[PDB]
């Protein structure tokens, strides 16, 4: 129940692992979704793989 | 980012490589050639394009 601007994240120039699976990273701004689930985390470097 | 099918500020806003490349991208370190103590700002980079 809110509008998502994924360009702020995609062009945030602060990430390093912005991989997308099943959706083109550049096409979130066009697609509409029933809901998102954002899972918070804190893991080590070698383990981001 | 210098390889076909990729994205990023260089791959999207500097120099796009088509998905059907035939060639090689060769690169090496240039720490002792291109860097100076006070900073070498002679290499320019864009972050914004239409």
Curated annotation (Swiss-Prot), chain B:
Origin superkingdom: Viruses
Mutagenesis / variant outcome for changing residue 9 to T: In strain: Gamma/P.1
Region of interest called Immunodominant HLA epitope recognized by the CD8+, as start-end residue ranges on this chain: 40-48
Effect of residue 32 to K: In strain: Omicron/BA.1, Omicron/BA.2, Omicron/BA.2.12.1, Omicron/BA.2.75, Omicron/BA.4, Omicron/BA.5, Omicron/BQ.1.1, Omicron/XBB.1.5, Omicron/EG.5.1
Outcome recorded upon mutating residue 45 to F: In strain: B.1.1.298
Record's function text: Attaches the virion to the cell membrane by interacting with host receptor, initiating the infection. The major receptor is host ACE2. When S2/S2' has been cleaved, binding to the receptor triggers direct fusion at the cell membrane. When S2/S2' has not been cleaved, binding to the receptor results in internalization of the virus by endocytosis using host TFRC and GRM2 and leading to fusion of the virion membrane with the host endosomal membrane. Alternatively, may use NRP1/NRP2 and integrin as entry receptors.
Self-association and partners: Binds to host ACE2. RBD also interacts with the N-linked glycan on 'Asn-90' of ACE2. Cleavage of S generates a polybasic C-terminal sequence on S1 that binds to host Neuropilin-1 (NRP1) and Neuropilin-2 (NRP2) receptors. Interacts with host integrin alpha-5/beta-1 (ITGA5:ITGB1) and with ACE2 in complex with integrin alpha-5/beta-1 (ITGA5:ITGB1). May interact via cytoplasmic c-terminus with M protein. May interact (via N-terminus) with host bilirubin and biliverdin, thereby preventing antibody binding to the SARS-CoV-2 spike NTD via an allosteric mechanism.
Designated name of the protein: Spike protein S1
């Amino acid at each position: 129940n809110c509008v998502a601007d994924y360009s702020v994240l995609y062009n945030s120039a602060s990430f390093s692992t912005f991989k997308c699976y099943g959706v083109s990273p550049t096409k979130l701004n066009d697609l509409c979704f029933t809901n998102v689930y954002a899972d918070s985390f804190v893991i080590r470097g070698d383990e981001v793989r | 980012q210098i390889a076909p099918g990729q994205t990023g500020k260089i791959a999207d806003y500097n120099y796009k490589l088509p998905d059907d490349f035939t060639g090689c991208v060769i690169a090496w370190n240039s720490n002792n050639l291109d860097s100076k103590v006070g900073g070498n700002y002679n290499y320019l980079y864009r972050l914004f394009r239409k």
